[PDB]
Amino acid sequence: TRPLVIIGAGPAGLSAAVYTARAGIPTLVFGSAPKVAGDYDIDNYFGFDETITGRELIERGRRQAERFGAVLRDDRILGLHHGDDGGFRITTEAGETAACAIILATGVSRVRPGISNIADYEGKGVSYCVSCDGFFYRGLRVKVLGEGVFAANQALELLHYTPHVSICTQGKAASITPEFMTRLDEAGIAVDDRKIASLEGTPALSVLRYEDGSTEEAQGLFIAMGEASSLDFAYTLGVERNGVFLGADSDQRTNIPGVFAAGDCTGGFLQIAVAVGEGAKAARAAISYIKEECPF
Ligand SMILES: Cc1cc2nc3c(=O)[nH]c(=O)nc-3n(C[C@H](O)[C@H](O)[C@H](O)COP(=O)(O)OP(=O)(O)OC[C@H]3O[C@@H](n4cnc5c(N)ncnc54)[C@H](O)[C@@H]3O)c2cc1C
Ligand SMILES: [Cl-]
Ligand SMILES: [Cl-]
Ligand SMILES: [Cl-]
Ligand code: NA
């Protein structure tokens, strides 16, 4: 089992990776280019008296982490679960892997579902965590909302509870890879790009209303838009939330041992300067955690 995985390759995850790798801990970082990493002027990050682009600042962060031995991977994470037993099981598009300690640095970027009355059906049909709520919809007709590999994997997990699963990409282009498409086809899980306008049903969800005015029956709607997010991981790990953010103490510890959180996903002042300090503090906490708990 690896001692440490960092999920996130923005300022928080990279600042943390620099510190952990310098302390001699084999460091594996998962993440892709953050949203800030484009042609945007950064002018308020300490130490840069001349304008630097987000793309270039992040690129220097990456070279900095690699300089001290951090390995950076572009793999998207699909799920995080407590391992059986001990440490954490990390689901990626490529397969599985495992880690003794996790630093969550996945930011707050989120594809939104775009359903006018979705809030009316929270707890009554609309769910998020499959391991959490899947059993309640066993044998039932369940729709997964989302366009990506995350949606595809959530749909496949749902098969543990019901054979009656399909995916709606909510008007978006699907970005499901051919390997996942194969798996969906083999399982009889259909994918279409219809757009759900609203939900219907009187004690609970029973009908999806498409922007057409056409309808489909479903008693379960699992939201899985875009990429798996900090909230999605929180649901499966049992990490306590603070509104839409992860709860973290001043040392970036969550309520789950071995799980730390840093950057935008702990939501205060959503800035590079802030993320870089949280990443550093998370690293310090992880390093001492690993020394007591994870031999390597
Ligand atoms: C255009 C733009 C301009 C900005 N301008 C400024 C500015 O001038 N000054 C300033 O201080 N701040 C600015 N910000 C805000 C600043 O970028 C953020 O506060 C900062 O990047 C937070 O860093 P982070 O590491 O917490 O998250 P992010 O930068 O969002 O990075 C999150 C990381 O998580 C990874 N990730 C997420 N989900 C997964 C997954 N499922 N699997 C694998 N990896 C995943 C992402 O790929 C990314 O690598 C700007 C942001 C944007 C977008
Ligand atoms: Cl700056
Ligand atoms: Cl143990
Ligand atoms: Cl209702
Ligand atoms: Na924060």
Author numbering: 3 to 298
Task: Quote the study on this structure.
Trx is a small redox-active protein (∼12 kDa), which has a conserved CxxC catalytic site that undergoes reversible oxidation/reduction of both cysteine residues whereas TR is a member of the flavoprotein family of pyridine nucleotide disulfide oxidoreductases and functions in a homodimeric form. Within each TR monomer, reducing equivalents are transferred to Trx from NADPH via a tightly TR-bound flavin adenine dinucleotide (FAD) and a redox-active disulfide (CxxC motif). A third TR named DvTRi (i for isolated) was identified in Desulfovibrio vulgaris Hildenborough (DvH). Enzymatic and structural characterization of DvTRi clearly shows that NAD(P)H does not serve as electron donor for the FAD while DvTrx1 was identified as the substrate.
The crystal structure of oxidized DvTRi was solved at 2.0 Å resolution, with one physiological homodimer per asymmetric unit. Each monomer is composed of a FAD-binding domain (residues 1–109 and 231–309) and a pseudo NADPH-binding domain (residues 119–225) linked by an interdomain hinge region (residues 110–118 and 226–230). The FAD protein environment is well conserved in DvTRi with a similar binding mode, through a network of supramolecular interaction involving structural water molecules and the conserved binding-motifs GxGxxG, ATG and GxFAAGD. The electron density of FAD is well defined with an occupancy close to 1 and the isoalloxazine ring of FAD is planar. In the pseudo NADPH-binding domain, the signature motifs VxxxHRRDxxRA and GGGxxAxE required for NADPH binding are replaced with the VxxxTQGKxxSI and the GEGxxAxN motifs, respectively. The only basic amino acid in the motif is lysine 174, which is well superposed with arginine 176 in EcTrxB. However, it is not sufficient to stabilize the phosphate group of NADPH since its binding requires seven salt bridges with three arginines in EcTrxR. The absence of crucial residues in DvTRi required for the binding of NADPH excludes the possibility for the enzyme to physiologically use this reductant, which is in complete agreement with our biochemical data. Whatever the crystallization conditions were, the different structures we solved from crystals 1 or 2 showed an unexpected unique conformation of DvTRi, that differs from both FO and FR conformations observed in EcTrxB structures. The structure revealed that the two active-site cysteines (the CxxC motif) are far away from FAD.
